[PDB]
Amino acid sequence: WRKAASLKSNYNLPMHKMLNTDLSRILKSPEIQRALRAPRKKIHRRVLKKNPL
């Protein structure tokens, strides 16, 4: 990364677009978790209309 080839006359390696791929390790950090809303796991379904009259 620091120097270059010396046998190819100009070739430095490809650069990374995304350093840390440890995705689970990221999303479980405290920094992000503090910056979140609450989830919502409760589930709502087709209620059946009954007749009041």
Partner: protein, 53 residues
């Protein structure tokens, strides 16, 4: 720059000797199958031998 650990040599009956080599920065380059598939399928044509009628 990322980590570059120590690789160990194995003599010609196994028998890990005391030689050690830190690996190169090639084995930390990014891995992209789409570019491999493209370069393969496109270079595997250049060995063809024509046909016709």
């Amino acid at each position: 720059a990322c980590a570059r650990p120590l690789i160990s040599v194995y003599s010609e009956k196994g028998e890990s000797s005391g030689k050690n080599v830190t690996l190169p920065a090639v084995f930390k380059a990014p891995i992209r199958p789409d570019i491999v598939n493209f370069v393969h399928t496109n270079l595997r044509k250049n060995n063809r031998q024509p046909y016709a009628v």
